[PDB]
Amino acid sequence: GKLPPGPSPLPVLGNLLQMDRKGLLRSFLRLREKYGDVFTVYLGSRPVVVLCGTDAIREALVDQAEAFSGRGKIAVVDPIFQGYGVIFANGERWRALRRFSLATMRDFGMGKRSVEERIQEEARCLVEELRKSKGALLDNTLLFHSITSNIICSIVFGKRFDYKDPVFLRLLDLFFQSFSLISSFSSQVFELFSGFLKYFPGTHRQIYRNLQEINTFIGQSVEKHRATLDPSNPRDFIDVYLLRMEKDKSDPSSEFHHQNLILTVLSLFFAGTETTSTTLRYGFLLMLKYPHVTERVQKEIEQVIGSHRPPALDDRAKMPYTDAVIHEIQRLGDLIPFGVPHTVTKDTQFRGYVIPKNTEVFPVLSSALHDPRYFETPNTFNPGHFLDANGALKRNEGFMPFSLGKRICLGEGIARTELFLFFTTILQNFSIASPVPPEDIDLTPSGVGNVPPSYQIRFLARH
Numbered sequence: 001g002k003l004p005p006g007p008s009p010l011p012v013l014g015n016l017l018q019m020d021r022k023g024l025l026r027s028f029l030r031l032r033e034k035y036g037d038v039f040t041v042y043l044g045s046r047p048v049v050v051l052c053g054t055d056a057i058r059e060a061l062v063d064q065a066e067a068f069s070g071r072g073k074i075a076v077v078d079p080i081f082q083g084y085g086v087i088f089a090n091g092e093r094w095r096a097l098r099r100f101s102l103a104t105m106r107d108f109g110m111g112k113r114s115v116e117e118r119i120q121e122e123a124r125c126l127v128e129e130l131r132k133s134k135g136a137l138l139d140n141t142l143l144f145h146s147i148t149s150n151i152i153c154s155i156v157f158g159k160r161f162d163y164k165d166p167v168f169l170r171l172l173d174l175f176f177q178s179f180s181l182i183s184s185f186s187s188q189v190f191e192l193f194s195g196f197l198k199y200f201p202g203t204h205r206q207i208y209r210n211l212q213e214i215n216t217f218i219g220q221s222v223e224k225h226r227a228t229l230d231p232s233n234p235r236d237f238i239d240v241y242l243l244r245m246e247k248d249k250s251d252p253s254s255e256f257h258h259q260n261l262i263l264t265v266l267s268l269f270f271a272g273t274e275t276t277s278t279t280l281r282y283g284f285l286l287m288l289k290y291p292h293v294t295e296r297v298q299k300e301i302e303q304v305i306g307s308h309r310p311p312a313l314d315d316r317a318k319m320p321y322t323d324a325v326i327h328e329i330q331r332l333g334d335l336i337p338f339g340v341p342h343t344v345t346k347d348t349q350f351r352g353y354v355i356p357k358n359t360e361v362f363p364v365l366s367s368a369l370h371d372p373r374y375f376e377t378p379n380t381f382n383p384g385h386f387l388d389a390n391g392a393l394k395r396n397e398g399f400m401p402f403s404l405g406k407r408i409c410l411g412e413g414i415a416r417t418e419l420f421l422f423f424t425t426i427l428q429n430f431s432i433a434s435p436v437p438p439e440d441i442d443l444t445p446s447g448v449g450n451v452p453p454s455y456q457i458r459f460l461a462r463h
């Protein structure tokens with residue numbers, strides 16, 4: 001090869017002068033145009049292989065799934081995670097934590113009720129809360145952050161919080177503030193030059209402080225769990241982990257220690273809230289812009305579910321139009337546009353190039369989600385992208401918003417359940433309106449995560 005082709009770097013500065021000022025995603029897409037679907041870019045000293053297009057991403061993450069199963073650091077959060085917890089671990093630590101997390105989230109949670117039942121109940125609480133606004137203008141950001149946070153709380157703490165609980169809201173505010181800071185231009189600069197910038201004030205110090213405050217709270221919950229534990233009846237993720245810590249106490253090689261507990265719980269909040277919340281927020285923005293689509297979803301809800309019974313996950317298979325709409329919301333939403341960093345786990349043979357062991361790799365998910373091979377109108381909201389000639393749901397190789405391979409989103413099922421039940425339970429009970437006429441609504445957004453514009457909305461009780 002030897003490494004994939006790319007711009008010639010400077011020492012220290014890497015490919016700074018070949019980057020685009022609009023950000024990392026724009027820098028990558030521009031470089032793609034010159035160098036092709038697989039290229040090397042130096043971010044500071046670090047060479048990083050970038051994978052664009054559906055093929056290159058699948059050839060890596062699926063065809064060499066084990067080789068591309070490594071996880072890269074994110075400079076602004078590494079001082080917190082330090083390669084612990086389920087997202088940022090590698091090797092055996094990652095395998096053990098992922099195996100445990102998959103199994104546990106599937107089986108243990110608030111009131112012994114299933115994840116689906118907990119989401120249905122959160123949706124019922126949400127409908128009750130929206131009813132109280134009586135059609136007032138609101139910004140739905142807070143409530144969407146609240147319901148997605150409450151699902152993770154149900155899983156990990158075995159409880160949910162009232163929407164107006166002030167301590168819940170103080171910690172929610174400072175937690176979600178972190179995402180904006182992580183996806184900012186300043187944090188992208190920090191990705192490049194952290195080795196220098198860590199010695200100076202900046203967003204990285206605010207991100208650190210916010211997440212440490214959350215870690216303190218998680219620590220306090222772990223102590224409270226331990227003090228109230230019934231080993232015959234584990235409540236939630238924390239109880240199950242404590243029991244595993246007990247089961248492995250005599251094994252100093254075990255990953256099931258305190259640091260992995262705190263940071264795995266943090267990881268579930270970090271990965272499980274913002275993306276799901278912003279998807280819902282983006283979805284409702286689209287539903288304001290395209291009332292004919294929203295009307296059709298409501299028609300389908302009426303036909304399949306009706307106007308009394310709450311939506312259930314079983315309904316989704318009978319609702320291909322609504323399902324296609326959710327797919328298209330995720331696709332156009334493109335909330336994690338250049339993926340979460342991977343690494344190769346060994347020197348890796350890829351398209352004639354050799355990628356040394358531990359080289360970082362970015363799967364540019366955006367480039368699959370906008371691939372014109374797979375989506376006739378990639379920049380236009382089109383639920384027909386996911387519907388066949390008989391009006392049935394159709395699957396698409398370009399559709400990869402949860403990534404692919406061994407690192408695929410651990411919470412894809414939960415996220416899928418949340419989108420379906422929240423969208424349908426809301427629309428079953430409320431129509432929507434806003435001060436801005438549909439044609440005037442602007443969908444224009446961004447870093448590791450995408451962020452749509454702020455907007456007002458009215459939830460109008462139907463009946």
Ligand code: HEM
Binds near residue numbers: 088273335406
């Ligand atoms: C619409 C919502 C969501 C989207 C689009 C999304 C997408 C993603 C993506 C792109 C990744 C990176 C995979 C990779 O490394 O290539 C990821 C990882 C992850 N996600 Fe999600 N996610 C969502 C919601 C959730 C939820 C609700 C949970 C938990 C219940 C969750 C848990 C995780 C975890 C733990 C990882 C790290 C996986 C690993 O490193 O093994 N996600 N997700």
Ligand SMILES: OC[C@@H]1O[C@@H](O[C@H]2[C@@H](O)[C@H](O)[C@H](OCCCCCC3CCCCC3)O[C@@H]2CO)[C@H](O)[C@@H](O)[C@@H]1O
Binds near residue numbers: 016017019020024188
């Ligand atoms: O050689 C110095 C100058 O080069 C040209 O500008 C270049 C670059 O030198 C110029 O710096 C600019 O790049 C923008 C800086 C990139 C930093 C932004 C990064 C911050 C971190 C994450 C996102 C990327 O874009 C142009 C790309 O062609 C200009 O045409 C001339 O002013 C001059 O020749």
Ligand SMILES: OC[C@@H]1O[C@@H](O[C@H]2[C@@H](O)[C@H](O)[C@H](OCCCCCC3CCCCC3)O[C@@H]2CO)[C@H](O)[C@@H](O)[C@@H]1O
Binds near residue numbers: 153168171172214269
């Ligand atoms: O006297 C203080 C206690 O009040 C009650 O509630 C506690 C705690 O038990 C309870 O867990 C609560 O937590 C509120 C904060 C929840 C934050 C969770 C966030 C994590 C990150 C994403 C957003 C959600 O804090 C309350 C105030 O201290 C508890 O019922 C009792 O333990 C005790 O009476």
